[PDB]
Design a binder for these strands. Sequence first.
RNA 1: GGCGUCUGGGGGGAACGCGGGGAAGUGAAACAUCUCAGUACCCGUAGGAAGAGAAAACAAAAUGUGAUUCCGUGAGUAGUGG
RNA 2: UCCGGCUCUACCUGGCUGGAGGGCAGUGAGAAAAUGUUGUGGUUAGCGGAAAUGGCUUGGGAUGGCCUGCCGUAGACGGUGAGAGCCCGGUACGUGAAAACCCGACGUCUGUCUUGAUGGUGUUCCCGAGUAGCAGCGGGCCCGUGGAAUCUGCUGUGAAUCUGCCGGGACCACCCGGUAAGCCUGAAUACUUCCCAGUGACCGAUAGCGGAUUAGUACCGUGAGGGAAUGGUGAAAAGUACCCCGGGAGGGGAGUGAAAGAGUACCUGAAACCGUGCGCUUACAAUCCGUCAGAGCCCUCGACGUGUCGUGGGGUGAUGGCGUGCCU
Lengths: 209, 93
Amino acid sequence: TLKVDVKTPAGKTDGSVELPAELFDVEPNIALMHQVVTAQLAAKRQGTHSTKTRGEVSGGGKKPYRQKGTGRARQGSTRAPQFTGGGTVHGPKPRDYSQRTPKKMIAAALRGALSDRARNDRIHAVTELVEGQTPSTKSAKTFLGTLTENKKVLVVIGRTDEVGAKSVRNLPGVHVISPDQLNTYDVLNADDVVFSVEALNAYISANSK
Amino acid sequence: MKVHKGDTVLVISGKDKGAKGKVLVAYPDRNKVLVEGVNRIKKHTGIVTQEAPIHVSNVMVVDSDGKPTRVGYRIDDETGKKVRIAKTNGKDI
RNA sequence: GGCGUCUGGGGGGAACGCGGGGAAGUGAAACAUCUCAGUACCCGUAGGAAGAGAAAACAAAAUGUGAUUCCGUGAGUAGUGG
RNA sequence: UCCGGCUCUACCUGGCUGGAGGGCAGUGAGAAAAUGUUGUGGUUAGCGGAAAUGGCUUGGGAUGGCCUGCCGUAGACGGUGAGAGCCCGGUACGUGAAAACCCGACGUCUGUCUUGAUGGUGUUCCCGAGUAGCAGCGGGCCCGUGGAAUCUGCUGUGAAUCUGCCGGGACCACCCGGUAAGCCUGAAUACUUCCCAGUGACCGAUAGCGGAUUAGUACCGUGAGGGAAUGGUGAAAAGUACCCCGGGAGGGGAGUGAAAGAGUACCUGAAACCGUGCGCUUACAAUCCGUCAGAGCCCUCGACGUGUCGUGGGGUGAUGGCGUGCCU
């Protein structure tokens, strides 16, 4: 049990949220997290790299010249790989890099990353990022400065919290994620993870149930 | 280009930064202007001296009170026209 | 058959569709059955998609499903084969 | 519902047919061609859009460094004289259509049911014909003719209408399923000549399309057809006025430029290859051309004097020893 006290943009404490042990107290597993984030980045990568083989390059259907009598090397096409302008032997072709990582591995890696953040009390909960109905980057920036002085932060707010997302959108170090889109890469990329109270409760409800 | 022939501008970058001048030729397809007394070269004809075009980003339109600004637009609702205004004081330029 | 008068057609187009015709190099360490392959190619025709489609169907004693199409399994299995 | 006209003719009874409500459907597979009004609905041009002329310093130039502010629903990406959120085009975010077209909607419009509906009783007729089935020869099904069902082409022969027919992998009996020889049918699916907006642990000029340059061009072939090579001055052309040698080309001064070791033979400018100058060596010598000793000469770094050693270093090497190129 670790306790997170909710802060409001007005600057006062609201309440507390109890972080369950099985979600924020697991022992981090470096190899597991490495595999998971590597698979993530492989799924991100698009393999739109291609080359033309010896048969896809233009022309070169006719045997060029005399095999014998010439005194020259015997060539079967003008598009053979040894020729300038000919095809590529083992060149890139379009491919998919995504891996079929098991669900338990992914969830455990996420839990390990979040537990590492919670061990060093880098987890924060807020009621709302700004006073509602109008985005304001100054107010959100000031509130984030009060919460933390680090460089890269992860903001986890609900999909309906449009005003907060727009408020923290333009800050260089801020990355905004939805509670059901939480992943190992984004957690491990962030020095601090600022949670929204509803988003935190939604994540706990989805997992601990 | 938000700056026109006959406008008076202040050079904000380059060799002649700080010099005021008058736009006498505008080149919309090049984003360049010709300004009096700035960016003068020495062409070998003897050797004569004349101005050369300067990128329109290096100059700024000066106000009535001689202060450079970004130029903005206000719509007149009476006639449907659209005039240039200064963003420093709001007055018409 | 002729005459007159109306309405259509003709040709082009990269891929995809449907219906017909249909190789050989190759593999089988030879080769003819077989494979390659109903591929390459060719012919006739479309449409924005086409084709199929409303049980003379499956099923197996379950008081069972309920037109067609497409996707995953069943499964490289049951089988089939100089 | 009501009214009207007919079922050979009139009278009293059962059916066919028009006209009024009432519905019910619609360009739909289920019949069709239209015609109006409307939807900040869409597409086909756009427009607006915050914040630094900030200070010092380097510099040809600040978009660099250090230090101050400011905007941010905008710190996407480019350009600008070198890494720019605040200089420009823009970006977030808002806004905009006379006309044409495309989607909707409501209508005129059209079709259509109301001469109608229900659940009951025992019998004749109908339920898709050169078809199904059968035979011969083929095709294709996991099935290559096999005991070979189901499906199908050509050639012969050729039925029944429901206690009829077909199927359940030869076939028969019994059960079960279905109702052939009539026709339409949307969605889920395939694709990209072309248009628009983007993306890349894709290429970066022998790469990437054959094609960044006259590219299916030049050129080759009678013809079908085959098929190249060629990108970079500079920030700006400011592209060298004028003088001199020279027929010119070219160059030397002089200027432009931050740079001409940027001069339209132009970024950088490697190797092969070709010169010029200096040092050492080489014309009695049998050399896989090096390697190990090595005199002499030249250069260089230290120490002491004047030249002479040193924990020295480099170039060349007379001379002696050894030594049969690489790959397959």
